[PDB]
Design an enzyme around this catalytic site. Structure first.
Site, PDB file in Angstrom:
ATOM      1  N   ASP A 140       3.860 -51.219  30.415  1.00 43.26           N
ATOM      2  CA  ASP A 140       3.479 -50.455  31.589  1.00 43.26           C
ATOM      3  C   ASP A 140       4.416 -50.708  32.776  1.00 43.26           C
ATOM      4  O   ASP A 140       4.210 -51.636  33.539  1.00 43.26           O
ATOM      5  CB  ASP A 140       2.042 -50.830  31.984  1.00 43.26           C
ATOM      6  CG  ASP A 140       1.448 -49.884  33.021  1.00 43.26           C
ATOM      7  OD1 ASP A 140       2.210 -49.156  33.681  1.00 43.26           O
ATOM      8  OD2 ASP A 140       0.212 -49.878  33.191  1.00 43.26           O
ATOM      9  N   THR A 141       5.406 -49.850  32.962  1.00 45.54           N
ATOM     10  CA  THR A 141       6.321 -50.006  34.095  1.00 45.54           C
ATOM     11  C   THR A 141       5.690 -49.738  35.455  1.00 45.54           C
ATOM     12  O   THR A 141       6.249 -50.144  36.486  1.00 45.54           O
ATOM     13  CB  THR A 141       7.543 -49.088  33.970  1.00 45.54           C
ATOM     14  OG1 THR A 141       7.111 -47.712  33.943  1.00 45.54           O
ATOM     15  CG2 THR A 141       8.305 -49.416  32.675  1.00 45.54           C
ATOM     16  N   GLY A 142       4.535 -49.081  35.467  1.00 41.21           N
ATOM     17  CA  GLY A 142       3.852 -48.775  36.724  1.00 41.21           C
ATOM     18  C   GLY A 142       2.981 -49.924  37.193  1.00 41.21           C
ATOM     19  O   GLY A 142       2.420 -49.893  38.307  1.00 41.21           O
TER      20      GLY A 142
HETATM   21  O1  LIG Z   1      -3.583 -49.786  38.626  1.00 43.58           O
HETATM   22  C1  LIG Z   1      -3.028 -49.004  37.862  1.00 43.58           C
HETATM   23  C2  LIG Z   1      -3.854 -48.009  37.148  1.00 43.58           C
HETATM   24  O2  LIG Z   1      -4.987 -47.781  37.574  1.00 43.58           O
HETATM   25  N1  LIG Z   1      -3.370 -47.412  36.045  1.00 43.58           N
HETATM   26  C3  LIG Z   1      -4.261 -46.510  35.274  1.00 43.58           C
HETATM   27  C4  LIG Z   1      -3.989 -45.026  35.406  1.00 43.58           C
HETATM   28  C5  LIG Z   1      -4.891 -44.100  34.872  1.00 43.58           C
HETATM   29  C6  LIG Z   1      -4.661 -42.726  34.994  1.00 43.58           C
HETATM   30  C7  LIG Z   1      -3.534 -42.249  35.673  1.00 43.58           C
HETATM   31  C8  LIG Z   1      -2.641 -43.160  36.218  1.00 43.58           C
HETATM   32  C9  LIG Z   1      -2.879 -44.535  36.089  1.00 43.58           C
HETATM   33  C10 LIG Z   1      -4.246 -47.044  33.865  1.00 43.58           C
HETATM   34  C11 LIG Z   1      -3.780 -46.278  32.801  1.00 43.58           C
HETATM   35  C12 LIG Z   1      -3.751 -46.810  31.514  1.00 43.58           C
HETATM   36  C13 LIG Z   1      -4.195 -48.109  31.287  1.00 43.58           C
HETATM   37  C14 LIG Z   1      -4.657 -48.891  32.336  1.00 43.58           C
HETATM   38  C15 LIG Z   1      -4.687 -48.355  33.626  1.00 43.58           C
HETATM   39  C16 LIG Z   1      -2.037 -47.882  35.602  1.00 43.58           C
HETATM   40  C17 LIG Z   1      -1.151 -47.053  34.662  1.00 43.58           C
HETATM   41  N2  LIG Z   1       0.131 -47.696  34.895  1.00 43.58           N
HETATM   42  C18 LIG Z   1       0.190 -48.413  36.169  1.00 43.58           C
HETATM   43  C19 LIG Z   1      -1.130 -47.990  36.814  1.00 43.58           C
HETATM   44  N3  LIG Z   1      -1.701 -48.965  37.744  1.00 43.58           N
HETATM   45  C20 LIG Z   1      -0.791 -49.696  38.662  1.00 43.58           C
HETATM   46  C21 LIG Z   1      -0.862 -48.965  39.965  1.00 43.58           C
HETATM   47  C22 LIG Z   1       0.118 -48.021  40.253  1.00 43.58           C
HETATM   48  C23 LIG Z   1       0.074 -47.284  41.427  1.00 43.58           C
HETATM   49  C24 LIG Z   1      -0.942 -47.493  42.343  1.00 43.58           C
HETATM   50  C25 LIG Z   1      -1.927 -48.434  42.071  1.00 43.58           C
HETATM   51  C26 LIG Z   1      -1.885 -49.162  40.887  1.00 43.58           C
HETATM   52  C27 LIG Z   1      -0.956 -51.189  38.754  1.00 43.58           C
HETATM   53  C28 LIG Z   1      -1.608 -51.914  37.747  1.00 43.58           C
HETATM   54  C29 LIG Z   1      -1.722 -53.309  37.843  1.00 43.58           C
HETATM   55  C30 LIG Z   1      -1.170 -53.979  38.934  1.00 43.58           C
HETATM   56  C31 LIG Z   1      -0.499 -53.273  39.932  1.00 43.58           C
HETATM   57  C32 LIG Z   1      -0.396 -51.882  39.837  1.00 43.58           C
END
Ligand SMILES: O=C1C(=O)N(C(c2ccccc2)c2ccccc2)[C@H]2CNC[C@@H]2N1C(c1ccccc1)c1ccccc1
Ligand SMILES: [Cl-]
Ligand SMILES: [Cl-]
Ligand SMILES: [Cl-]
Lengths: 99, 99
Positions: free
Chosen positions: B25-27
């Site tokens: 997960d790059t995000g």
């Molecule tokens: O916190 C998340 C997050 O909620 N997701 C979701 C998601 C669902 C639907 C659309 C977009 C994102 C997710 C998806 C699949 C599995 C688990 C969670 C993450 C998807 N990839 C990163 C995203 N991050 C980030 C994030 C990014 C932008 C704004 C807030 C949060 C994250 C995760 C953990 C720590 C820091 C940031």
């Protein structure tokens, strides 16, 4: 380009005539953009992540330009804290993970 | 390897001798795993997810294998829809985004 992951992989995108900063997010199935207006039909949708679900508007067949690469696809609009480019558009620009 | 994004980039990880599935997960800034037993002391951490902020447990210096590559780093334990390997460990295994 090759983008390392020491920091958040943020890029400039162009959507609906606006420039925004967005995250290249391989963990997101969908692309989710902060509140803005887009033309055409939409339908409500619920997407769930860390911290629970949010309600978004789903717009289909939306063109976005991402780092000079144009793609078309579904864009969800709603209260995301960060603009997210998800896999539905990352595939279209030929983005891969490599190690 | 090179991993394309037409499907979720789910991989097998090994933590505490057990195999689990997780998304590359790059995000994600951080690595977030569903409730499990980890050794050592933990401290509190708040993360802002797409749905809102949650409190998780932060364990440092955890040994974890990801798609065959050994990493040693911070793992957060908490409610996440899917286990996610974030940038902190993606950098350790030499992962980049490419297009
Ligand atoms: O916190 C998340 C997050 O909620 N997701 C979701 C998601 C669902 C639907 C659309 C977009 C994102 C997710 C998806 C699949 C599995 C688990 C969670 C993450 C998807 N990839 C990163 C995203 N991050 C980030 C994030 C990014 C932008 C704004 C807030 C949060 C994250 C995760 C953990 C720590 C820091 C940031
Ligand atoms: Cl799409
Ligand atoms: Cl391809
Ligand atoms: Cl770490």
């Amino acid at each position: 380009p090759q983008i390392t992951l020491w920091k958040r992989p943020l890029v400039t995108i162009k959507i609906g005539g606006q420039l925004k900063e967005a995250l290249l997010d391989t963990g997101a199935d969908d692309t989710v953009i902060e509140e803005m207006s887009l033309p055409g039909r939409w339908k409500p949708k619920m997407i769930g992540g860390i911290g629970g679900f949010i309600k978004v508007r789903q717009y289909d067949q939306i063109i976005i330009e991402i780092c000079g690469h144009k793609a078309i696809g579904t864009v969800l609009v709603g209260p995301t804290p960060v603009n997210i480019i998800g896999r539905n558009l990352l595939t279209q620009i030929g983005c891969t993970l490599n190690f």
